[model samples]
Target: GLEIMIGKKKGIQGHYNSCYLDSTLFCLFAFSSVLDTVLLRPKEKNDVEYYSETQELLRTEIVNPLRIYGYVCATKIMKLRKILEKVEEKDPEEFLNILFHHILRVEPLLKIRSAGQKVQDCYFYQIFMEKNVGVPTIQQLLEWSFINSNLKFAEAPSCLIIQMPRFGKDFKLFKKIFPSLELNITDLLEDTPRQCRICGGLAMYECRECYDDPDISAGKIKQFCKTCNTQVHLHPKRLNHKYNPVSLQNMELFAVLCIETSHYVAFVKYGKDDSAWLFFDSMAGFNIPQVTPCPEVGEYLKMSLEDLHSLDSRRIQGCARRLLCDAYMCMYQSPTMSLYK
Candidate 1:
């Protein structure tokens, strides 16, 4: 029987223009295919039967589920293959640099703002806060961005994706973001009541510039009701910034993929527990496709993002800890919703 690479493959051998999409596909397949219970064991132990069994399993287990969960990725893969077959060598980073914008059509999964201010599902919350101030932690930055911009989820998404603020491989805004393990956006939801930043009353207004207001603390959301907002902005310096009304508002750190020196590896979350992680490398030295358990990342996620900052990333014990320093995109999905969508 001919050996097929689906189940038996370890490290995907080095292929030009494939690692980016390959690693992405592997993560998507692993995350969704956990429920695949069917075993198309070739009965006759023949090559043709094994290949046939592989095809059937691909249909039932891989292709069908992926069609709904990541229809964009599935559809894009066909186009990628069709275009790249002609080139013997190509840059995956360059390929992804363009298509990522297309593949990540986050509109269907995310919606927010009752005011008709079109907002996407995933956000690139600008990192710079105070003009000359220090950077805030990722969680703080996210919370601030959500409130200031009046961002909220249309509904609890089955899957959520967020990208850090950086433009492509060459341009990193400054450098580094403090990675958070879990994100709680309960306070940031639309149609939800939040306390005034100045007074403990229900808020009615939010100012993007007041986020950097001299009177407000750096890196905190500045939301207030009409009275406080008027009083706060009555100050001559703050009068100019336009304020928006609050809307209704809305993760685990899973699957940290890093690109350094143009190399790639990914950690996929296997379960909700701290130790539920898998590290995959498409071009590991063995040259097949490699997946290894990294329960340490689970243990690492157990610590608060602040705790992670005190220690040097270089000394971090495991792949997951190092992943914190290199995270490009973070993915989260509700297990309950994942079943349906």
Candidate 2:
């Protein structure tokens, strides 16, 4: 079992609609060190004059204090917020852009490639898809988004921040969305080894057209070994379908940022156990922010999608409801990949 101390004042305090910044910061620094390199990187000559100043403030005033004391004052946050006086009213993506791109000058976290295109770098991947699936899982949506766009990860990313499919803060594609505890990204990489979808052997070919075939593994990337490829495509339906040589990867979820009615909050995984979840609400009440233990979040996460859907929505109480229904962004990281970065 993993235990994390949670009390009334154990998170970043809110001020002047700073929930966007608060939630994003908490998700990045609370219990994960994957992105710490940005704080530790040395200031270069071409960097802005305030580079070290901003980095020091984030590491010492915010992240270090929160990790050590489990609390950070709004005054400290306002200091950093003022620095971005140069920036946004609410969106976390915009906050990340200004902070990472303009102020800190950190390297992009993801490297993605699309069919017949060069590798493109980005800090976060925004999930975009037309209205479909009444109840979608993050894994399914990610696969569909990648397959539909003909995209693949050029290289494994140390940190993967995926924005959920929604039209700003007003609309969401699904009334209930399940968060995949562990994302299997093995089939989403450009040139990595992948096992065949139908067999256990190494995959030699992949067909985008066969992705949604119900007879095989539907909602998963379709990959096959040489023999399996020929046999499968022999079917009349897939005879003319285009196929290509294959390659593979996995990432684990750590944090989820949720927004409801323009208010932002976060659910963070503090330890390895499924029950080690903590909920942070920058504006839980008035000016004081709060972090509370929400073990039920993990419990709900472990439930089968059928069971979860079968349960009455009203019975699914506390912070767990917001996490499942209003998720705006999910953050994942590769423990092994971070070691190399």
Candidate 3:
């Protein structure tokens, strides 16, 4: 049996991203135990009587399937061994963060959507972290977290998770209670953008899907051709900004306005299958434009050091102009990505 990893429930559960080597170990052991009882021991009178009803577990049937499961398990054990070896040799911090985000999210060590099951799995996980036998990939992230010697330790920055912020609390009361959380440079880096789209004329065009009358809900799709959706996607974060002279307000956006709502929006550019309009959207939140788009006028920039003393400024500007022209021309093929219905 492999050694158990031990730690806080969250941390241990997180280690499975280190590739639940311990969990896989459990599966292998359980299968091996079944093989010994079902295949190795001579068939007894009671065993024959018991399995007679379920003939599918007969010697001939059990032997082949058990062998396959055992072989697969052995192969996985070796691969897991390699990963564990890597963990011990490598820094574990950066690797662990990657594991938390990617591997853990995809782990099937438990059933999908099972909350209690997930928590139980966590208890098992914590035990695995403290194991004596090495897990290499796990250790790699450890070095990355600290003792690199070159990088300074930084306090994990505070994150404002605006994905559903509490709003029942009054603004004044919240400010009074969390006074230290005053609006300042710390939070002000995130500014609302209020600039209007630089369209040749104010964009006024109805969606083709609406005109076709096939905006009906047929295929699995979210219905309600919401006017709000139309505005946010087509228009930028203009609705999110707080301006003194906010001349124009999208009625669709104002309709869904809330105290703690995201300032982002979404709209249609084109539709799919020629039946639906491409309804692009900036989420109601994440609407940020803290900085105005700067004009690249006649500003001097560092030139290539390859020709250190040479002042070939004209060549640099020509390269920049060429890049701008190439970008505007759409050199790459358009990608077609879709999900769900």
Candidate 4:
């Protein structure tokens, strides 16, 4: 059956767990892999009881939690082909590692839930003129971020404005405001359209990621550029070049990060019901046509540019007014504030 929520399979004397559903869905191994590596077909009759107890424990400890956290379809836990007590034991550490890894994968279910609760709308986002261009405005925010301040997004800083500080509208007022300011006397003037971050032409481009790179699956650091290429061949400091994140866990994570290099992009939860899927990946006609029938899950943007100007949260509402939660956040600082360290 596709789903085994939780209970005994037909032949087993006691209940078994169906926790491996996500592991299977993500192409990771299940309790079977553990048995293959650790459990040898028993030679003596007494070994049966010890193996049964071990299997039951694995279910209660690992499988049960995955279900409780709302990570997998409950049906997966209840309807399995076999019960755990019928299985064999393996190295405790190996079993533990596999369990933890899968748990991490499913926790994104909670992350997807929690993300909307505390939307991190940056304070600078309020001051920039980001929205109302032609397209969605992650780019405008990125550009204004360059002109106004430092500390770009924690990820690789997207190319923002080519100029540093902006002299909005009144050149006379700007001179009166900072008379001592030394302009870099150039053709580049305020009010003139800014240059693009990457291609350096008209400022109208966002990142385009490619998942088809063979090196992505190979688990080798694919040099994205000649500078990056040379660095990937030899670690920047250690100068080591080898397959590091080859196993599925690290590899999948790297794939996510590579796509995320596009400004303001972060992984969103995938709901089986809603598929505004914006990923180009393997499986299905994700081939040349680059398509799939998944729910509509897009990157969650913390703040847009033009809306950043309306400091009052009440004025800004996203696709789902619920896109913003609480709509308010602030901080008070004291060098000696004892309420929190």
Candidate 5:
């Protein structure tokens, strides 16, 4: 259950050009404790000289106060920004890299394998696709990106941070992107149990070419057990297709970082209910940031793409519009893995 209070003067305070940092910090520490380990991780001999200082500042000055009083001063945030020398305009992705890698020196969050290559370690994934759909879902975008690149998770990550396919603050690929309430990554893991696309039994083979085959579950990763695989490929049209062995995984959405015309904001999941969401904006007021209950976002998230697009954008209430349309990054976590950490 959420113990933190929600109202005006809540959330991180904004300073000069600090919305990127403010929003990112809020997303990581506010309601999600998956990354709290970083703040309490013991120092090492090989760590930076000011490692303790940075960690202390983040914990005592910013996170603790925000969680306790539901408010943190801009001065506290400014001090940390000075330590990182991140004074200018920047994106949340850059801030996360510097904080997690250069300062805290945490382990990479994601491990992915590309075909026959060695596994690649990354802190986050940036979605890349050639074609655009009128209204795309995060689940579809992630599946499409992974299938097109022949990539799979080398191991399930405790936290999955996915950057949307837009380049920079502008150039959005789709006008409306449905946020998948629960992302099923079962088909994106390597060396794991996967169900047959046809028979619903254990799968042995996966065919990339058949992913878009209209006759056989189009827009889904095509995997099949031995008997099903043989029957599928025996079809005259698929005789020349190549196939490979299979695997599986899953994650749940917790936070979303959004950007519009360079300003940054966030939507954080506060409870299990569909309406248990909160919208945060560092610069919502003059120097004082704000956190408002946004139950409307949950309602929008539950709508079908056709239903969502049919509603006038002007009618979308509160912060739900930006969250649905201008989302920059979506953060997910494995509930089971998080317990061990």
Candidate 6:
């Protein structure tokens, strides 16, 4: 029923003041259709126990509520369900805060390693290191995270949810971050061909030290061939830094959520074309919540992947720009793994 979504502006009234649940559910609804087709299919080789249970629960709580006739009350039943049991309550919490803590029980999302540190990994979120020299945008940050940590995907995941680097209502590492529409993650894989930064030859080594080298590909992952790696690191200044090898996809960005003054709002991708999108705010105006059709987002999504880097944040304003620069979580779906049709 994504067809029903087009040109239709539907509203889901709020209940129990669960804006956290409201906003998060809106995000899931915005893109859940993509996953729906998969779960609803006759049957598959692999058993998707969790996703099956998840799909059923979501339908009962979210879809059935909307599809039924009258005033849709999206209550705090996602509200009533325990947001958390063990560690606490500050009287209120965002859905991301709750889901990661209580609801989701899954395999590790990321596996990372430093030469000295044990392969510490994460399931819900990955924290980027705060450094003076770092990649500027989310796409670059994603690439850098895997490269810097000497990591790779054990198996490509169907859904990838990324949490931006920032403390709770305390600090934001970057003033503005570029939201990538289509993320080409081919080079970030393990055992994959990577072009050298210098001559576009097959890259054999990745330099963590030269990542910010002023003379070469500054602020980007500095990957080089065996010859280039030796030639560049031959310098007295680069002699000590470590260099690691790597191997790495297409990611379709679907939803983004951000926090402002402890309030959360979401932007979700709709339809198959890269441009279809929507914006939802649980507490934007009055008692009930609404999802607005925002086309400006499609304009930004339409830009070339390379063009996203130097974008002037000032020129991009309103909900579209806010979705790009103020995101706390960015969710992407892989074409190869997520495909159902």
Estimated TM-score for each candidate: 0.62, 0.91, 0.14, 0.19, 0.93, 0.71
Which residue runs does candidate 4 get wrong by more than 4 Å? 1-132, 150-267, 271-341
Give one clash count per candidate, in the order shown.
15, 3, 42, 22, 1, 11
Deviation from native of the Cα of residue 242 in model 5, angstroms = 1.1
Cand. 5 Cα-lDDT: 0.82
Name the lDDT value of residue 152 in candidate 2: 90
RMSD of each: 9.2, 2.9, 28.2, 22.2, 2.7, 5.7
- Superior by lDDT: candidate 2 or candidate 4: 2
Q: Model 6, which residues run further than 4 Å from truth?
A: 1-3, 6-12, 33-56, 63-72, 76-104, 116-121, 126-135, 143-154, 167-174, 233-241, 272-274, 283-286, 300-317, 336-341
lDDT of 2 by residue, 1-341 (tens): 12232667778888878898889999988888888899899988889878888999999999988877788888888899888875434589889999998888888889998886888999999877666634678888888889888899888888999988776465544357788888888888877778887777789998988876888986667889999999999999999989987753568788999987778899988776788788888887348777888888877888887777787767787778888878889999985532122
Ranking of models by lDDT: 5, 2, 6, 1, 4, 3
Task: List model 1 lDDT by residue over 164-261, tens digit each.
Answer: 55644645433345555566665566666768877778888877777765558565677888898888878898778898887641255555666545
Candidate 3, after superposition: displacement of residue 16 in Å?
A: 15
Across residues 281-320, which tens digit of lDDT does each residue of candidate 6 receive? 6654336565677778777766665466567767875875
Superposed on all Cα atoms, model 4 deviates from the true structure by an RMSD in Å of 22.2
Per-residue CA lDDT of candidate 5, range 1-341, in tens?
34454777889988879898889888887877778889899999999877899999999999888877888899988898888874224678778888888888989999999987998999999887665445788898899999888899988888999988775366544356777878988778877788898879889999988987988887888999989999999999999888987743568788899887778899988866789888898887358788988888877778778888788876787578898888888999875432122
Q: Score residue 224 of candidate 3 by CA lDDT.
A: 19
Query: Each prediction's Cα lDDT score?
Result: 0.54, 0.82, 0.21, 0.23, 0.82, 0.60
Model 1 worst lDDT window (10 residues): 1-10
Arrange candidates, best TM-score first.
5, 2, 6, 1, 4, 3
lDDT of 4 by residue, 206-275 (tens): 1112111343323111213333334344545324433221111000010010011111111111221232
What's the distance in Å from true for residue 139, model 1?
Answer: 2.4
